[PDB]
C-alpha cells in the first residue's frame, strides 16, 4: 500500500496544491495557499486494524511504524539532494549566513561521517547547499537509526544526531525559504523548496499516521480480568452506568490499577501488549485508537483507562466506531454522555472524532435502513457537539462496493447532512480502491481534486436539509426495510 | 577489593578445602568434603552499601554487578584452558562420549566462531578437551556479553550462547567428573578438576554476591511520599502498629500501589532507582537487602513492599541492621513480631538473617555496654527463632579497630553466645582488614583456617553460658558504663 504513497501520492500532492494556488489566483487571491496548511493528509490502517485479525501483532505494529519512518527518510533524502543541485544561489540572509559558516568551518558539525567527501567538496559561497547538506546528514541518520531499531531494538546512532520531531526538521527548511525571500528570490523559493516544505507538513516524518483499531469486547475482557484478579467483582456483569462510574473513579484516581502478575489469555496479552508498543513508539507515528463495535461511553472510557494504565505517556485520542444499527441510534446519546463528563471533556480539549461504519451497517439492517440511520446519526451527533462546543470530525468507513458505502466521491459527500463536515473529515480508501484512485499520476490528482472540491462546496454551500415529511417517510420505510431484510 | 579475590582467594579456596579433605582423612573419614559444600563464601558491599554515601548510585551498583561477572568468566577461562591441557585422557563413559561426538561433529555446536582454530585442531579421542572446549567457548561469550551489557545497553550475543545459570555451568563439569570416576580415574578427577568445581560452587558466575544496604528512614521517606500523593495520609506520622497494619494490607493485596507520576526528591529517586536496578539484574548477583538504623518490624515490611512495588521479580531477603543500643534491646521483640505474621513467615521460609552493628553500637552506648547488649541480642534472638522454627543467621559487622568489634578471629567467635552459630554466619572484612587477611597466599589460607576452625568448634563444643550472678552484674555495670560514657 505504501508503493502508492511512493509512486503517485508523494509527488502528486505538491502538484495538486500548486493548482489550488493557481485556482486561488484566478479568483483574485494574490497569495499561494500557505505551506503549513494540511489541505489533504494521508493515514494508514495497514498495521493497526486488528479487528478480527489475530495476525496483526504488537510486533507488527512496531515494524510498520519504523518501516514508514525509513521510507519517509529515504524519500526526503532524494528530494533534498535534487534541491541541493538547484539552490546554487549565493545570496542568503544573515541568520542563514551565520549557520552556514558553523556547518562549513566545522565540517558538517560531525553528525554523519557518511557524506564526508561532500563536506570537502563544498565551495564556500553555496549557503543553501550547506544548510541542506546538514539536513541530509541528519536524515540519513533518521533513516539508519530506524533500520537499527527494526533489526536490533537499539542504535549506536543517538536521537539528537537525527530528526526526532517535525519541528526539528522544519527549522532549517523554513530558514532556507525565509532567506530566499529576504534576498528577493521569493520566486526561486516558491519552486522546488515550496513543494518540499509542503511535503513535510503533509507527510511528516512517518509518511502516514497509523490508526489502531480493536474490538469493543476485547477491552471488556481485559478489564473484567482486572476486576476479577483484584476481587472487585466482574466488570462484565456490571450495568453500563456502573461501569462508567467505576471507570471514572479510576481515571480520576492517582493509584495504579493494572497488576503485573495478572493472569492473561493470549487474547488479553495481544491487547495489553499492543498498548505497550504504543507507549514506546513516538506519539507522532500514531493517529487515533478506534474501537470497533462501539456501543456506549463505557467502551471509550475503558480504553482511555487501559491506555493510561499501560504506560502511554501521551495517549492516542479514542474514537468510537458505530458499526451496527442499534449503536448508531444510541450514538448521539453516547456522545452526549461522554461530553457531559468533567474528566472526559478536559481530556479531549474541544476535539472529538467518531467513526461510522458503512460496511457492517448494511449487513445488520437493510441497505436503505443503514444509509438513512447513518445520515441522522451524523446529523444529531453534530448537533450534540455544536451544543457542547466540541469540534466533531466524522470518520467515514466507506468501501468500494455500493453496499459498503461506495459511489463517486463528490456524490458521497453531497449526500452527507448539511453542516456536518466543515473543513474536517476522514474517509477510508479500502484495498483495491487505492488502485482505483492512485494507480496513475492523473488518477491521484483527480482524487485529491474530488475530495477537496466537494468538501469545500459542501461547507460553504450545503445541500437541503430534508423536509419533515421526508424524514417521517424515511423513518417508517427504514423499519419496513429493516424487517424485510 | 576484587584484586584480593583474584590474587589470593581464587587459588586459595581450593587449597584450603583440600586441607579439610586431608584433615578429614586424618580422623579416618575416607571421603572428600563433597564439592557442593560451600564451607566458605565471599560477598561484597563494594557497590551496594549506600548508607550515608550518595555517591553509590543505582548505576554504580549496575556497573559493579557486570564488572564482577566479567572478572568471574575471565578467571574461569584461564582455569578451563589449563584443565584442557591436563585432561588428555581418552577413556570416557557413554554419556560423555555421546555429547562429545555431538559437539565435535558440529564444530562446537555453533556457539562463538572464536576459538574456531581450536575446533579444527581437536583430534577425536580427546573427549575431555571437547566438552571443556565448548565450556570455554561458552565462557568467552559470557564475559563478552557482560562487556557489551556494560559498555552499552545490550549485546548481540544471545542468552543461550553463554552461561546464564550456575546449574548450566555445572552441568558439563560434573559430567566430566563422573566420567573420570566411572573409568576408575577418580584420582585424576580429584586433581585440577575438583579444584575448579569447588570454585564454581564457591564463586558462582558473579564471583561475589552484592549486599545492598540503605538507611531506615530513607524508605520511610518513599512510603510517606506515596501515602501523601494518593491522599491515604502521612505514613511518617503513623504509629508503629499502624504502619505494620497498613503495610500488611498492601502485602496481602494484589493491587499495585506505586504511582508512576509520583513526585520524587533526588533522594527518593535514588531509592526507587536502586530497586529498579535490582529488578533488572539476575537475582543470583545479590545477597540480601540490609536496613541500617533498623528499629522496628515496620522497616523490614516497608522494604518488602517497596521491593515488590518496584518490580523486583524475585526479591532479595530483607535483613535489619540493629546498629544502636535501644534497637538491640527491642531487637528480639521486633524479630518475634516479624515472625508470627503469617505473611512474613511464608516469605522467609524458615530462613531469617539479621545484622548486628559493632561500629555504631559502641558510639551510642560505649565499649562495655555495647559489647554486652550485643551478647544478649544474639542470645535472645536465637531463642525466639528457635521457638518459631526459624534458622537465624547472624551477620556480624566488625572491622579493624578494637573499638569496632575488632580482634583475633577465633577469639571473637569464642566470645559469641553458645548455640547462636551452628554452621551459619557472616562477618564483615572491612577495607584495610582485607589486606590484613588476604594480602598474601599464606595469610589467606590462615584466615580461612581460623573462621572454619572457630565456627566448627563453637557449634559442637560451645563456650560456657554465664552464671546468673555474672549476668546480673553485667546488666548493672552496663547501665553505669553507658551513663558515664
JSON list of C-alpha atoms in Angstrom, two decimals, chain A residues 212-409:
[
{"chain": "A", "resi": 212, "resn": "UNK", "atom": "CA", "xyz": [-5.12, 1.45, 15.78]},
{"chain": "A", "resi": 213, "resn": "UNK", "atom": "CA", "xyz": [-8.39, -0.50, 15.78]},
{"chain": "A", "resi": 214, "resn": "UNK", "atom": "CA", "xyz": [-9.67, -3.11, 18.25]},
{"chain": "A", "resi": 215, "resn": "UNK", "atom": "CA", "xyz": [-12.93, -4.94, 19.02]},
{"chain": "A", "resi": 216, "resn": "UNK", "atom": "CA", "xyz": [-15.03, -3.41, 21.82]},
{"chain": "A", "resi": 217, "resn": "UNK", "atom": "CA", "xyz": [-15.47, -6.61, 23.86]},
{"chain": "A", "resi": 218, "resn": "UNK", "atom": "CA", "xyz": [-11.73, -7.26, 23.77]},
{"chain": "A", "resi": 219, "resn": "UNK", "atom": "CA", "xyz": [-11.18, -4.36, 26.14]},
{"chain": "A", "resi": 220, "resn": "UNK", "atom": "CA", "xyz": [-14.04, -5.63, 28.28]},
{"chain": "A", "resi": 221, "resn": "UNK", "atom": "CA", "xyz": [-12.23, -8.96, 28.72]},
{"chain": "A", "resi": 222, "resn": "UNK", "atom": "CA", "xyz": [-9.06, -7.18, 29.84]},
{"chain": "A", "resi": 223, "resn": "UNK", "atom": "CA", "xyz": [-10.91, -5.02, 32.34]},
{"chain": "A", "resi": 224, "resn": "UNK", "atom": "CA", "xyz": [-13.01, -7.93, 33.62]},
{"chain": "A", "resi": 225, "resn": "UNK", "atom": "CA", "xyz": [-9.71, -9.73, 34.07]},
{"chain": "A", "resi": 226, "resn": "UNK", "atom": "CA", "xyz": [-8.54, -6.89, 36.30]},
{"chain": "A", "resi": 227, "resn": "UNK", "atom": "CA", "xyz": [-11.69, -6.61, 38.44]},
{"chain": "A", "resi": 228, "resn": "UNK", "atom": "CA", "xyz": [-11.70, -10.40, 38.87]},
{"chain": "A", "resi": 229, "resn": "UNK", "atom": "CA", "xyz": [-8.00, -10.54, 39.94]},
{"chain": "A", "resi": 230, "resn": "UNK", "atom": "CA", "xyz": [-8.41, -7.66, 42.39]},
{"chain": "A", "resi": 231, "resn": "UNK", "atom": "CA", "xyz": [-11.68, -9.19, 43.64]},
{"chain": "A", "resi": 232, "resn": "UNK", "atom": "CA", "xyz": [-13.81, -6.11, 42.96]},
{"chain": "A", "resi": 233, "resn": "UNK", "atom": "CA", "xyz": [-16.17, -8.40, 41.03]},
{"chain": "A", "resi": 234, "resn": "UNK", "atom": "CA", "xyz": [-16.91, -8.87, 37.32]},
{"chain": "A", "resi": 235, "resn": "UNK", "atom": "CA", "xyz": [-16.66, -5.72, 35.17]},
{"chain": "A", "resi": 236, "resn": "UNK", "atom": "CA", "xyz": [-18.52, -7.70, 32.51]},
{"chain": "A", "resi": 237, "resn": "UNK", "atom": "CA", "xyz": [-21.61, -8.24, 34.69]},
{"chain": "A", "resi": 238, "resn": "UNK", "atom": "CA", "xyz": [-21.90, -4.57, 35.67]},
{"chain": "A", "resi": 239, "resn": "UNK", "atom": "CA", "xyz": [-24.58, -2.41, 34.09]},
{"chain": "A", "resi": 240, "resn": "UNK", "atom": "CA", "xyz": [-23.32, 0.33, 31.77]},
{"chain": "A", "resi": 241, "resn": "UNK", "atom": "CA", "xyz": [-23.94, 3.06, 34.34]},
{"chain": "A", "resi": 242, "resn": "UNK", "atom": "CA", "xyz": [-21.97, 1.06, 36.92]},
{"chain": "A", "resi": 243, "resn": "UNK", "atom": "CA", "xyz": [-19.05, 0.68, 34.50]},
{"chain": "A", "resi": 244, "resn": "UNK", "atom": "CA", "xyz": [-18.99, 4.42, 33.80]},
{"chain": "A", "resi": 245, "resn": "UNK", "atom": "CA", "xyz": [-18.92, 5.25, 37.50]},
{"chain": "A", "resi": 246, "resn": "UNK", "atom": "CA", "xyz": [-16.12, 2.79, 38.32]},
{"chain": "A", "resi": 247, "resn": "UNK", "atom": "CA", "xyz": [-14.05, 3.80, 35.29]},
{"chain": "A", "resi": 248, "resn": "UNK", "atom": "CA", "xyz": [-14.29, 7.50, 36.20]},
{"chain": "A", "resi": 249, "resn": "UNK", "atom": "CA", "xyz": [-13.30, 6.85, 39.82]},
{"chain": "A", "resi": 250, "resn": "UNK", "atom": "CA", "xyz": [-10.26, 5.13, 38.36]},
{"chain": "A", "resi": 251, "resn": "UNK", "atom": "CA", "xyz": [-9.50, 7.69, 35.67]},
{"chain": "A", "resi": 252, "resn": "UNK", "atom": "CA", "xyz": [-9.62, 10.44, 38.28]},
{"chain": "A", "resi": 253, "resn": "UNK", "atom": "CA", "xyz": [-7.74, 8.24, 40.77]},
{"chain": "A", "resi": 254, "resn": "UNK", "atom": "CA", "xyz": [-3.98, 8.61, 41.21]},
{"chain": "A", "resi": 255, "resn": "UNK", "atom": "CA", "xyz": [-3.40, 4.95, 42.03]},
{"chain": "A", "resi": 256, "resn": "UNK", "atom": "CA", "xyz": [-2.16, 2.21, 39.66]},
{"chain": "A", "resi": 257, "resn": "UNK", "atom": "CA", "xyz": [-4.68, -0.44, 38.75]},
{"chain": "A", "resi": 258, "resn": "UNK", "atom": "CA", "xyz": [-3.14, -2.99, 36.36]},
{"chain": "A", "resi": 259, "resn": "UNK", "atom": "CA", "xyz": [-1.31, -5.74, 38.33]},
{"chain": "A", "resi": 260, "resn": "UNK", "atom": "CA", "xyz": [1.88, -7.15, 36.72]},
{"chain": "A", "resi": 261, "resn": "UNK", "atom": "CA", "xyz": [1.11, -10.66, 37.95]},
{"chain": "A", "resi": 262, "resn": "UNK", "atom": "CA", "xyz": [-2.20, -10.53, 36.10]},
{"chain": "A", "resi": 263, "resn": "UNK", "atom": "CA", "xyz": [-3.03, -13.89, 34.52]},
{"chain": "A", "resi": 264, "resn": "UNK", "atom": "CA", "xyz": [-3.65, -13.41, 30.78]},
{"chain": "A", "resi": 265, "resn": "UNK", "atom": "CA", "xyz": [-5.05, -15.36, 27.82]},
{"chain": "A", "resi": 266, "resn": "UNK", "atom": "CA", "xyz": [-3.17, -14.94, 24.53]},
{"chain": "A", "resi": 267, "resn": "UNK", "atom": "CA", "xyz": [-6.02, -12.56, 23.64]},
{"chain": "A", "resi": 268, "resn": "UNK", "atom": "CA", "xyz": [-5.66, -10.38, 26.74]},
{"chain": "A", "resi": 269, "resn": "UNK", "atom": "CA", "xyz": [-1.91, -10.31, 26.10]},
{"chain": "A", "resi": 270, "resn": "UNK", "atom": "CA", "xyz": [-2.28, -9.20, 22.48]},
{"chain": "A", "resi": 271, "resn": "UNK", "atom": "CA", "xyz": [-4.40, -6.27, 23.79]},
{"chain": "A", "resi": 272, "resn": "UNK", "atom": "CA", "xyz": [-2.16, -5.15, 26.61]},
{"chain": "A", "resi": 273, "resn": "UNK", "atom": "CA", "xyz": [0.99, -5.79, 24.60]},
{"chain": "A", "resi": 274, "resn": "UNK", "atom": "CA", "xyz": [-0.47, -3.52, 21.94]},
{"chain": "A", "resi": 275, "resn": "UNK", "atom": "CA", "xyz": [-0.75, -0.57, 24.34]},
{"chain": "A", "resi": 276, "resn": "UNK", "atom": "CA", "xyz": [2.80, -1.34, 25.48]},
{"chain": "A", "resi": 277, "resn": "UNK", "atom": "CA", "xyz": [4.03, -0.89, 21.88]},
{"chain": "A", "resi": 278, "resn": "UNK", "atom": "CA", "xyz": [2.01, 2.31, 21.53]},
{"chain": "A", "resi": 279, "resn": "UNK", "atom": "CA", "xyz": [3.76, 3.59, 24.63]},
{"chain": "A", "resi": 280, "resn": "UNK", "atom": "CA", "xyz": [7.33, 3.05, 23.42]},
{"chain": "A", "resi": 281, "resn": "UNK", "atom": "CA", "xyz": [6.92, 4.45, 19.94]},
{"chain": "A", "resi": 282, "resn": "UNK", "atom": "CA", "xyz": [6.96, 8.22, 19.27]},
{"chain": "A", "resi": 283, "resn": "UNK", "atom": "CA", "xyz": [3.48, 9.77, 19.63]},
{"chain": "A", "resi": 284, "resn": "UNK", "atom": "CA", "xyz": [3.70, 11.39, 16.16]},
{"chain": "A", "resi": 285, "resn": "UNK", "atom": "CA", "xyz": [3.59, 7.98, 14.47]},
{"chain": "A", "resi": 286, "resn": "UNK", "atom": "CA", "xyz": [0.01, 7.36, 15.59]},
{"chain": "A", "resi": 287, "resn": "UNK", "atom": "CA", "xyz": [-3.44, 8.59, 14.75]},
{"chain": "A", "resi": 288, "resn": "UNK", "atom": "CA", "xyz": [-6.44, 7.67, 16.94]},
{"chain": "A", "resi": 289, "resn": "UNK", "atom": "CA", "xyz": [-7.35, 4.43, 18.71]},
{"chain": "A", "resi": 290, "resn": "UNK", "atom": "CA", "xyz": [-10.51, 3.12, 17.09]},
{"chain": "A", "resi": 291, "resn": "UNK", "atom": "CA", "xyz": [-12.96, 0.97, 18.98]},
{"chain": "A", "resi": 292, "resn": "UNK", "atom": "CA", "xyz": [-14.83, -1.30, 16.59]},
{"chain": "A", "resi": 293, "resn": "UNK", "atom": "CA", "xyz": [-18.26, -2.45, 17.81]},
{"chain": "A", "resi": 294, "resn": "UNK", "atom": "CA", "xyz": [-18.57, 0.68, 19.93]},
{"chain": "A", "resi": 295, "resn": "UNK", "atom": "CA", "xyz": [-21.91, 0.76, 21.77]},
{"chain": "A", "resi": 296, "resn": "UNK", "atom": "CA", "xyz": [-21.81, 3.04, 24.84]},
{"chain": "A", "resi": 297, "resn": "UNK", "atom": "CA", "xyz": [-19.46, 5.55, 26.56]},
{"chain": "A", "resi": 298, "resn": "UNK", "atom": "CA", "xyz": [-18.06, 2.72, 28.73]},
{"chain": "A", "resi": 299, "resn": "UNK", "atom": "CA", "xyz": [-16.30, 1.32, 25.64]},
{"chain": "A", "resi": 300, "resn": "UNK", "atom": "CA", "xyz": [-14.50, 4.67, 25.14]},
{"chain": "A", "resi": 301, "resn": "UNK", "atom": "CA", "xyz": [-13.52, 5.19, 28.80]},
{"chain": "A", "resi": 302, "resn": "UNK", "atom": "CA", "xyz": [-12.48, 1.52, 29.01]},
{"chain": "A", "resi": 303, "resn": "UNK", "atom": "CA", "xyz": [-9.71, 2.23, 26.50]},
{"chain": "A", "resi": 304, "resn": "UNK", "atom": "CA", "xyz": [-8.82, 5.61, 28.00]},
{"chain": "A", "resi": 305, "resn": "UNK", "atom": "CA", "xyz": [-8.11, 3.67, 31.22]},
{"chain": "A", "resi": 306, "resn": "UNK", "atom": "CA", "xyz": [-6.32, 0.72, 29.60]},
{"chain": "A", "resi": 307, "resn": "UNK", "atom": "CA", "xyz": [-4.21, 3.22, 27.68]},
{"chain": "A", "resi": 308, "resn": "UNK", "atom": "CA", "xyz": [-3.17, 5.21, 30.76]},
{"chain": "A", "resi": 309, "resn": "UNK", "atom": "CA", "xyz": [-2.65, 2.08, 32.84]},
{"chain": "A", "resi": 310, "resn": "UNK", "atom": "CA", "xyz": [-0.34, 0.52, 30.26]},
{"chain": "A", "resi": 311, "resn": "UNK", "atom": "CA", "xyz": [2.02, 3.50, 30.29]},
{"chain": "A", "resi": 312, "resn": "UNK", "atom": "CA", "xyz": [1.08, 5.51, 27.18]},
{"chain": "A", "resi": 313, "resn": "UNK", "atom": "CA", "xyz": [2.60, 8.84, 28.35]},
{"chain": "A", "resi": 314, "resn": "UNK", "atom": "CA", "xyz": [0.71, 10.87, 25.71]},
{"chain": "A", "resi": 315, "resn": "UNK", "atom": "CA", "xyz": [-2.43, 8.82, 24.91]},
{"chain": "A", "resi": 316, "resn": "UNK", "atom": "CA", "xyz": [-3.93, 8.39, 21.42]},
{"chain": "A", "resi": 317, "resn": "UNK", "atom": "CA", "xyz": [-7.33, 10.13, 21.28]},
{"chain": "A", "resi": 318, "resn": "UNK", "atom": "CA", "xyz": [-10.01, 7.44, 21.41]},
{"chain": "A", "resi": 319, "resn": "UNK", "atom": "CA", "xyz": [-12.64, 7.28, 18.65]},
{"chain": "A", "resi": 320, "resn": "UNK", "atom": "CA", "xyz": [-15.71, 5.02, 18.81]},
{"chain": "A", "resi": 321, "resn": "UNK", "atom": "CA", "xyz": [-16.90, 3.11, 15.74]},
{"chain": "A", "resi": 322, "resn": "UNK", "atom": "CA", "xyz": [-20.64, 2.78, 15.38]},
{"chain": "A", "resi": 323, "resn": "UNK", "atom": "CA", "xyz": [-20.97, -0.16, 13.02]},
{"chain": "A", "resi": 324, "resn": "UNK", "atom": "CA", "xyz": [-24.41, -1.56, 13.76]},
{"chain": "A", "resi": 325, "resn": "UNK", "atom": "CA", "xyz": [-27.94, -0.15, 13.62]},
{"chain": "A", "resi": 326, "resn": "UNK", "atom": "CA", "xyz": [-28.65, -0.16, 17.35]},
{"chain": "A", "resi": 327, "resn": "UNK", "atom": "CA", "xyz": [-25.32, 1.52, 18.15]},
{"chain": "A", "resi": 328, "resn": "UNK", "atom": "CA", "xyz": [-25.87, 4.26, 15.52]},
{"chain": "A", "resi": 329, "resn": "UNK", "atom": "CA", "xyz": [-29.27, 5.05, 17.07]},
{"chain": "A", "resi": 330, "resn": "UNK", "atom": "CA", "xyz": [-27.95, 5.29, 20.62]},
{"chain": "A", "resi": 331, "resn": "UNK", "atom": "CA", "xyz": [-24.92, 7.07, 19.20]},
{"chain": "A", "resi": 332, "resn": "UNK", "atom": "CA", "xyz": [-25.64, 10.76, 19.75]},
{"chain": "A", "resi": 333, "resn": "UNK", "atom": "CA", "xyz": [-26.82, 9.74, 23.22]},
{"chain": "A", "resi": 334, "resn": "UNK", "atom": "CA", "xyz": [-23.48, 8.02, 23.81]},
{"chain": "A", "resi": 335, "resn": "UNK", "atom": "CA", "xyz": [-21.65, 11.11, 22.51]},
{"chain": "A", "resi": 336, "resn": "UNK", "atom": "CA", "xyz": [-23.53, 13.45, 24.84]},
{"chain": "A", "resi": 337, "resn": "UNK", "atom": "CA", "xyz": [-22.87, 11.32, 27.90]},
{"chain": "A", "resi": 338, "resn": "UNK", "atom": "CA", "xyz": [-19.14, 11.45, 27.17]},
{"chain": "A", "resi": 339, "resn": "UNK", "atom": "CA", "xyz": [-19.30, 15.21, 26.56]},
{"chain": "A", "resi": 340, "resn": "UNK", "atom": "CA", "xyz": [-21.09, 15.73, 29.88]},
{"chain": "A", "resi": 341, "resn": "UNK", "atom": "CA", "xyz": [-18.30, 14.19, 31.98]},
{"chain": "A", "resi": 342, "resn": "UNK", "atom": "CA", "xyz": [-15.94, 16.73, 33.54]},
{"chain": "A", "resi": 343, "resn": "UNK", "atom": "CA", "xyz": [-12.95, 14.43, 33.13]},
{"chain": "A", "resi": 344, "resn": "UNK", "atom": "CA", "xyz": [-13.51, 13.37, 29.53]},
{"chain": "A", "resi": 345, "resn": "UNK", "atom": "CA", "xyz": [-14.04, 16.98, 28.44]},
{"chain": "A", "resi": 346, "resn": "UNK", "atom": "CA", "xyz": [-10.66, 18.13, 29.80]},
{"chain": "A", "resi": 347, "resn": "UNK", "atom": "CA", "xyz": [-9.13, 15.17, 28.04]},
{"chain": "A", "resi": 348, "resn": "UNK", "atom": "CA", "xyz": [-10.40, 15.85, 24.53]},
{"chain": "A", "resi": 349, "resn": "UNK", "atom": "CA", "xyz": [-9.95, 19.63, 24.70]},
{"chain": "A", "resi": 350, "resn": "UNK", "atom": "CA", "xyz": [-12.70, 20.55, 22.24]},
{"chain": "A", "resi": 351, "resn": "UNK", "atom": "CA", "xyz": [-11.93, 17.89, 19.66]},
{"chain": "A", "resi": 352, "resn": "UNK", "atom": "CA", "xyz": [-13.95, 14.67, 19.23]},
{"chain": "A", "resi": 353, "resn": "UNK", "atom": "CA", "xyz": [-13.65, 12.32, 16.24]},
{"chain": "A", "resi": 354, "resn": "UNK", "atom": "CA", "xyz": [-16.11, 9.44, 15.75]},
{"chain": "A", "resi": 355, "resn": "UNK", "atom": "CA", "xyz": [-16.19, 6.67, 13.13]},
{"chain": "A", "resi": 356, "resn": "UNK", "atom": "CA", "xyz": [-19.25, 5.49, 11.22]},
{"chain": "A", "resi": 357, "resn": "UNK", "atom": "CA", "xyz": [-19.18, 2.10, 9.51]},
{"chain": "A", "resi": 358, "resn": "UNK", "atom": "CA", "xyz": [-20.97, 1.71, 6.21]},
{"chain": "A", "resi": 359, "resn": "UNK", "atom": "CA", "xyz": [-19.87, -1.91, 5.91]},
{"chain": "A", "resi": 360, "resn": "UNK", "atom": "CA", "xyz": [-21.32, -3.75, 8.90]},
{"chain": "A", "resi": 361, "resn": "UNK", "atom": "CA", "xyz": [-24.41, -1.47, 8.93]},
{"chain": "A", "resi": 362, "resn": "UNK", "atom": "CA", "xyz": [-25.79, -2.58, 5.61]},
{"chain": "A", "resi": 363, "resn": "UNK", "atom": "CA", "xyz": [-25.24, -6.13, 6.88]},
{"chain": "A", "resi": 364, "resn": "UNK", "atom": "CA", "xyz": [-27.25, -5.52, 10.07]},
{"chain": "A", "resi": 365, "resn": "UNK", "atom": "CA", "xyz": [-30.25, -3.60, 8.67]},
{"chain": "A", "resi": 366, "resn": "UNK", "atom": "CA", "xyz": [-31.12, -3.17, 5.00]},
{"chain": "A", "resi": 367, "resn": "UNK", "atom": "CA", "xyz": [-29.16, -1.00, 2.60]},
{"chain": "A", "resi": 368, "resn": "UNK", "atom": "CA", "xyz": [-31.90, 1.63, 2.83]},
{"chain": "A", "resi": 369, "resn": "UNK", "atom": "CA", "xyz": [-32.22, 1.49, 6.62]},
{"chain": "A", "resi": 370, "resn": "UNK", "atom": "CA", "xyz": [-28.43, 1.75, 7.06]},
{"chain": "A", "resi": 371, "resn": "UNK", "atom": "CA", "xyz": [-27.87, 4.69, 4.71]},
{"chain": "A", "resi": 372, "resn": "UNK", "atom": "CA", "xyz": [-30.65, 6.60, 6.47]},
{"chain": "A", "resi": 373, "resn": "UNK", "atom": "CA", "xyz": [-29.59, 5.78, 10.01]},
{"chain": "A", "resi": 374, "resn": "UNK", "atom": "CA", "xyz": [-26.05, 6.79, 9.08]},
{"chain": "A", "resi": 375, "resn": "UNK", "atom": "CA", "xyz": [-27.46, 10.10, 7.84]},
{"chain": "A", "resi": 376, "resn": "UNK", "atom": "CA", "xyz": [-29.14, 11.22, 11.03]},
{"chain": "A", "resi": 377, "resn": "UNK", "atom": "CA", "xyz": [-26.56, 9.58, 13.26]},
{"chain": "A", "resi": 378, "resn": "UNK", "atom": "CA", "xyz": [-24.22, 12.17, 11.75]},
{"chain": "A", "resi": 379, "resn": "UNK", "atom": "CA", "xyz": [-26.74, 14.94, 11.84]},
{"chain": "A", "resi": 380, "resn": "UNK", "atom": "CA", "xyz": [-27.55, 14.58, 15.54]},
{"chain": "A", "resi": 381, "resn": "UNK", "atom": "CA", "xyz": [-24.02, 13.88, 16.77]},
{"chain": "A", "resi": 382, "resn": "UNK", "atom": "CA", "xyz": [-23.05, 17.12, 15.06]},
{"chain": "A", "resi": 383, "resn": "UNK", "atom": "CA", "xyz": [-25.88, 18.81, 16.96]},
{"chain": "A", "resi": 384, "resn": "UNK", "atom": "CA", "xyz": [-24.82, 17.37, 20.33]},
{"chain": "A", "resi": 385, "resn": "UNK", "atom": "CA", "xyz": [-21.26, 18.51, 19.64]},
{"chain": "A", "resi": 386, "resn": "UNK", "atom": "CA", "xyz": [-22.15, 22.03, 18.47]},
{"chain": "A", "resi": 387, "resn": "UNK", "atom": "CA", "xyz": [-24.13, 22.36, 21.70]},
{"chain": "A", "resi": 388, "resn": "UNK", "atom": "CA", "xyz": [-21.14, 21.28, 23.82]},
{"chain": "A", "resi": 389, "resn": "UNK", "atom": "CA", "xyz": [-18.70, 23.40, 21.79]},
{"chain": "A", "resi": 390, "resn": "UNK", "atom": "CA", "xyz": [-16.77, 20.36, 20.57]},
{"chain": "A", "resi": 391, "resn": "UNK", "atom": "CA", "xyz": [-15.37, 20.18, 17.02]},
{"chain": "A", "resi": 392, "resn": "UNK", "atom": "CA", "xyz": [-16.74, 16.91, 15.66]},
{"chain": "A", "resi": 393, "resn": "UNK", "atom": "CA", "xyz": [-14.82, 15.10, 12.92]},
{"chain": "A", "resi": 394, "resn": "UNK", "atom": "CA", "xyz": [-16.72, 12.31, 11.22]},
{"chain": "A", "resi": 395, "resn": "UNK", "atom": "CA", "xyz": [-14.67, 9.29, 10.11]},
{"chain": "A", "resi": 396, "resn": "UNK", "atom": "CA", "xyz": [-16.32, 7.53, 7.21]},
{"chain": "A", "resi": 397, "resn": "UNK", "atom": "CA", "xyz": [-15.81, 3.81, 6.75]},
{"chain": "A", "resi": 398, "resn": "UNK", "atom": "CA", "xyz": [-16.65, 3.51, 3.05]},
{"chain": "A", "resi": 399, "resn": "UNK", "atom": "CA", "xyz": [-15.85, 0.58, 0.80]},
{"chain": "A", "resi": 400, "resn": "UNK", "atom": "CA", "xyz": [-15.54, 0.13, -2.96]},
{"chain": "A", "resi": 401, "resn": "UNK", "atom": "CA", "xyz": [-18.79, -1.70, -3.48]},
{"chain": "A", "resi": 402, "resn": "UNK", "atom": "CA", "xyz": [-22.07, 0.23, -3.38]},
{"chain": "A", "resi": 403, "resn": "UNK", "atom": "CA", "xyz": [-23.44, -1.77, -0.46]},
{"chain": "A", "resi": 404, "resn": "UNK", "atom": "CA", "xyz": [-20.48, -0.77, 1.66]},
{"chain": "A", "resi": 405, "resn": "UNK", "atom": "CA", "xyz": [-20.86, 2.96, 1.11]},
{"chain": "A", "resi": 406, "resn": "UNK", "atom": "CA", "xyz": [-19.30, 3.03, -2.32]},
{"chain": "A", "resi": 407, "resn": "UNK", "atom": "CA", "xyz": [-20.01, 5.54, -5.05]},
{"chain": "A", "resi": 408, "resn": "UNK", "atom": "CA", "xyz": [-18.49, 8.59, -6.82]},
{"chain": "A", "resi": 409, "resn": "UNK", "atom": "CA", "xyz": [-16.59, 10.75, -4.34]}
]
